[PDB]
């Protein structure tokens, strides 16, 4: 359970559908979500924040997600010099997922036999 990340389908569409289950289960209340409907009618988020200085790195959000959108990736080396660099918004989490997608998929090909 490392740095949180947001994932896509192979087409390039976001997996997240703003169900707010990960926000409800979070014991630290480290997630803040706002949503409305997109211009094509889809149900998508407009804000998805994770306070990494409030997070406890439990993985409960990863368990609660029904579409495998939020994960905790294999990155542990993400120390910064300012605390404002650790208040992640939606764009940075998507950038993390776009960085770590192949490793996350390799990990999930094994861990889907157990979960």
């Amino acid at each position: 359970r490392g740095e949180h990340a947001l994932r896509r389908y192979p087409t390039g569409e976001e997996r997240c559908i703003a169900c707010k289950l990960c926000e409800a289960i979070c014991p630290a209340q480290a997630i803040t979500i706002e949503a409305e409907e997109r211009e094509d009618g889809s149900r998508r988020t407009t804000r998805y924040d994770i306070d990494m200085t409030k997070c406890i790195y439990c993985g409960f959000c990863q368990e609660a997600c029904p579409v495998d959108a939020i994960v905790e990736g294999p990155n542990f080396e993400f120390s910064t010099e300012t605390r404002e660099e650790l208040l992640y918004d939606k764009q940075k989490l998507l950038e993390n997922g776009d960085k770590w997608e192949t490793e996350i998929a390799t990990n999930l090909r094994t861990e889907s036999l157990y979960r």
């Binding site: 389908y9 976001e14 409907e37 211009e39 009618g41 889809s42 998508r44 407009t46 804000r47």
Partner: protein
């Protein structure tokens, strides 16, 4: 008796009428009411994607619009979003009758589009 009401003579303020959030074709009729919340109103942002994406970066909506609809034989299709059902979305059963390449049916989880040439047409 009971005269008809003329709705076309009802005045609407021009500031309100030009600011209605509407939709492109997608999963609705084009031009129906689009639900919005208050986020971005102070910064004057009326668009869904601009509320969290900054720059000329390729949006997720522009990614899914480049994938063509998929021809499926039958009347109902099951959508998982993956080859492996454990790795995708909960299964969505999408109606395919009355659908064509021009007016396909869209998955509410994945945004993939499907149509069938099997409903006697």
């Amino acid at each position: 008796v009971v005269p008809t009401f003329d709705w076309k003579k009802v005045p609407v303020p021009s500031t309100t009428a030009k600011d209605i959030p509407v939709t492109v074709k997608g999963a609705t009729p084009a031009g129906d009411l689009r639900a919005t919340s208050g986020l971005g109103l102070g910064d004057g942002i009326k668009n869904h994607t601009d509320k969290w994406l900054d720059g000329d970066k390729k949006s997720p909506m522009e990614y899914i619009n480049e994938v063509a609809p998929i021809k499926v034989k039958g009347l109902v299709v099951a959508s998982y979003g993956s080859d492996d059902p454990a790795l995708g979305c909960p299964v969505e059963y999408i109606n395919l009758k009355g659908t064509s390449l021009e007016n396909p049916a869209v998955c509410k989880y994945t945004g993939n589009r499907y149509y069938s040439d099997d409903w006697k047409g």
